[model samples]
Target: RERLRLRRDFLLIFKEGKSLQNEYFVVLFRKNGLDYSRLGIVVKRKFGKATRRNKLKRWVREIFRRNKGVIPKGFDIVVIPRKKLSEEFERVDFWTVREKLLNLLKRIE
Candidate 1:
């Protein structure tokens, strides 16, 4: 099962120190004597209707799930959708997101 709870501590991490990018969301931190990673989907209301937002979120989650093994075990990852995601977006699929994330992880690793 997947843990989707947004704990108070996690929010604190976001408030205190977290990185943001145009193509990805991030929340890198240490927890439970081990490095943990978490991905977030921030599909704003501006991204068409609720259905589209949910679709993007689902895609992002699936991407992380599929590539979780390759990710380095020592940091949190957040995935935020860009506003342009719903407009002429051809790379909204899971494979694209996964590949991009994997590439980023490779660099970070």
Candidate 2:
């Protein structure tokens, strides 16, 4: 999957689409004209320090990358992670993250 990087793109997706949520993230998505899908991430300081924050972002990206083909295309997907003060990032492997993401994806409209 591709990434949604522009500020305008984020604004449009935020303004246009509905969202899905779980304990870890709030996923906002909008259908785009392009043939391929795109993704964006919003992580604030409240979540954790730079390392933990980046780890969370990378985890989502990796999850998306692995599931790109499984997910429907032509949509802008923005993943906004919730705040987590204590990060046990090392313990949370792909399988751990995949479960949450799969549950969220199933409910996405």
Candidate 3:
């Protein structure tokens, strides 16, 4: 249920955190000294219309919600879905999204 809500948090991650990129999205993260990890999602206007943007946002939040156990602790993580992702959004299943995100999360350590 925790999230990165402030602009400064996002700025810190963007400026200081290391990042990884794949076909679907980019992940930027830094260790935050807290016991639990926090998440932030960036769905820019370039991604799509309001409805489509919200759809991906919801998916990212749900993925984090269900798999918090798998994600590394004590970190601030941000996810930015790519424009290319929208092309595959219709064909990709939820499990695929889960798997891809988990793959990235597991590599964070």
Candidate 4:
């Protein structure tokens, strides 16, 4: 079966799940009965202009798409980017987001 894609339904997970705060972002997830999981990216306007926010969304979605299988089934994940993300994107390796996601999924598992 095809995996679940991010949609308005997944945003509900953000509203209900507990948040995990880090230097660059906050992660939230909720377990559900669906066959596959979905992802939601929330980047505040304070982070940057439209172009920058879109870039961050693309980066987050790419990371999630690549690692979606590793996440437990039947859950929705929401990633909220912190203001520091703009600065961190310049100073740190981009792969850190993927690593953090893996780590979070590991913890959940």
Candidate 3 per-residue lDDT over residues 27-74, each given as its tens digit:
999998889888889988978899988999899999998998988998
Q: Which stretches of candidate 2 lie over 4 Å from their true place?
A: 1-3, 84-91
lDDT of each: 0.56, 0.75, 0.86, 0.72
Output the lDDT of residue 32, model 2.
Answer: 84
Q: Is candidate 2 or candidate 3 better by lDDT?
A: 3
Best by TM-score: 3
User: Distance (Å) between predicted and true CA of 102, model 2?
Assistant: 2.7
Model 3 off-target regions past 4 Å? 1-3
Give the TM-score of each candidate: 0.64, 0.82, 0.91, 0.77
> Which whole-number lDDT from 0 to 100 does residue 3 have in model 3?
54
Deviation in angstroms for 80 in model 4? Answer: 0.4
Mind giving the per-residue lDDT tens digits that candidate 2 earns over 18-57? 8998776788988887787777888877777899878887
Model 1 bad stretches (over 4 Å)? 1-4, 7-10, 20-36, 90-93, 105-109
What lDDT tens digits, residue by residue, belong to model 4 across residues 1-109? 4454555555566577766767777878788677787777777778788997888888888887787777777766677887676777656666887786667665653
Q: Residues 16-99, candidate 1, lDDT per residue (tens digit)? A: 544534354332333322555565554557776877677777777776677778766655554555545566344556666666
Best by lDDT: 3
Question: TM-score of predicted model 2?
Answer: 0.82
In what order do the candidates fall by TM-score, top score first? 3, 2, 4, 1
Per-candidate Cα RMSD to the true structure, in Å, reads 3.5, 2.5, 1.5, 2.8
lDDT of 4: 0.72
